[PDB]
């Protein structure tokens, strides 16, 4: 034993226990989800209201990369911010050289390679976040989810955090009941519901819902936050479904 004391060390299994311990930090975090719709993607996250002293709608968790990519994550929040800062550098240098905004699959690998690099040495710690991200490019909509190991895949729906099992079950129903697809406005409503349903795992404290979306028709392929009436409409739909 001792194989779990240092990053980048293979155990006799062929496992990197430090990365597996980083996953535990992710599992401890709040719930975040991603839904791929007809012409775009929708991101949503659970924000635990630790106290009444928290200013509503101020501690924004979802982050934009470039102008067409949204990123949300569960686990250690600073680690997620560090990853997004890198993502923004990667996207900037891509656009600087190639002119076109970075494609989502291209952007996914940039994060993937960077996170994977933090599993190669004992002088660094793995990332304590699973990141759900995506957006619209020339080839259409893309949704991704990126783990501490650097592993990522494309998704129809994605979920991570403490209420991931509950969320996943809900996402699987949507995939089955909508083979032709889901609209952007529908996805926002469904996203609100799923976060509310996934809040049963964090039922002690009350929470604040935060949603964002990129859609070719609804937002011109740009990342925007769901605000005001459209947000309230989604909250009402969500509250109706739990009762």
């Amino acid at each position: 034993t001792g194989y779990d004391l240092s990053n980048s060390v293979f155990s006799p299994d062929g496992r990197n226990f430090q990365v597996e311990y980083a996953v535990k930090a992710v599992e401890n975090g709040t719930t975040s989800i991603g839904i791929k719709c007809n012409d775009g993607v929708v991101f949503a996250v659970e924000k635990l209201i630790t106290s009444k002293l928290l200013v509503p709608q101020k501690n924004v968790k979802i982050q934009v990369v470039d102008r067409h990519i949204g990123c949300v994550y569960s686990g250690l929040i600073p680690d997620g911010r560090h990853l997004v800062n890198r993502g923004r550098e990667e996207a900037a240098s891509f656009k600087k050289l190639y002119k076109t905004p970075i494609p989502i699959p291209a952007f996914a690998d940039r994060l993937g390679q960077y996170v994977q690099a933090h599993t190669l040495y004992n002088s660094v710690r793995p990332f304590g976040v699973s990141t759900i991200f995506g957006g619209v490019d020339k080839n259409g909509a893309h949704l991704y989810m990126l783990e501490p190991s650097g592993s990522y895949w494309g998704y129809k729906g994605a979920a991570t955090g403490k209420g991931r099992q509950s969320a996943k079950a809900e996402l699987e129903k949507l995939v089955d009941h909508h083979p032709e697809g889901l609209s952007a406005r529908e996805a926002v409503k469904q996203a609100a519901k799923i976060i509310y349903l996934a809040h049963e795992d964090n039922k002690e404290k009350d929470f604040e819902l935060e949603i964002s979306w990129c859609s070719l028709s609804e937002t011109n392929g740009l990342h925007k936050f769901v605000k005001g009436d459209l947000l309230q409409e989604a909250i009402d739909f969500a509250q109706k479904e739990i009762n």
Binding site: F10, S11, P12, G150, K156, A158
Partner: protein
């Protein structure tokens, strides 16, 4: 017992971190197979999409390194993509510096040397992957060259990699014992892919749908992967005889 944590010699003269990287290779539970035709080199690999939420089009362990070279990986995807990106960069740099397309065997050697360095230098860990490079080389013809975490590499008539590699290896061995040639004597790549799939079915003892497989084909001056419908056509031909 820190001789098991970093790449230094144990009293037996062994490198345990290298041996444990070999074990990570089978973590995906995927089997790959590569064979050579007359004009082509075919590589097939099991495709497993366990989650319904996954976009199955993005789930792949076959990579297009250059126009001519293709690479299938046995091991975790992060290390797989690490190796893929490097191999792409190395292939591009080679063409720029030396004015011709990097051969499959030379790329394999280069990646093998990089892997060797990780077994000797302490700060760098080995990658938990086995890289199988395929092409139709302009000098050597159809080529299969495979690299592992030890930094070892060699050319192959055919090869198999994964948990059930031995069953596939023996199946292929027995075929080449009959035919007494170093390749599949077939004109079209379509029939070489059919051979590859047929012999994987026989070795593993499992039937395959169009979404259970992943196929890569190398011809002269290009390497390409088959779509689900291209594979379906391949599976239909197998069943009809």
């Amino acid at each position: 017992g820190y001789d098991r944590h970093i790449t230094i010699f144990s009293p037996e003269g062994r490198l345990y971190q290298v041996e444990y990287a070999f074990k990570a290779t089978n973590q995906t539970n995927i089997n790959s197979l590569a064979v050579r035709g007359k004009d082509c080199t075919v590589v097939i690999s099991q495709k497993k999409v366990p989650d319904k939420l996954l976009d199955p089009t993005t789930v792949s362990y076959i990579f297009c390194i250059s126009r001519t070279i293709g690479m299938v990986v046995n091991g975790p995807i992060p290390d797989a993509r690490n190796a893929a990106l490097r191999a792409k960069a190395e292939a591009a740099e080679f063409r720029y510096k030396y004015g011709y397309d990097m051969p499959c065997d030379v790329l394999a050697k280069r990646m093998a040397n990089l892997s060797q360095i990780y077994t000797q230098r302490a700060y760098m860990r080995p990658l938990g992957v086995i890289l199988t490079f395929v092409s139709v080389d302009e000098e050597l013809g159809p080529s299969i060259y495979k690299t592992d975490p030890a930094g070892y590499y060699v050319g192959y008539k055919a090869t198999a990699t994964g948990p059930k590699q031995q069953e596939i290896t023996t199946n292929l061995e027995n075929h080449f014992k009959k035919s007494k040639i170093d390749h599949i004597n077939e004109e079209s790549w379509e029939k070489v892919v059919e051979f590859a799939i047929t012999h994987m079915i026989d070795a593993l003892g499992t039937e395959f749908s169009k979404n259970d497989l992943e196929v890569g084909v190398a011809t002269k001056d290009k390497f390409f992967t088959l779509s689900a419908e291209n594979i379906e056509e391949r599976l239909v031909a197998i069943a009809e005889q």
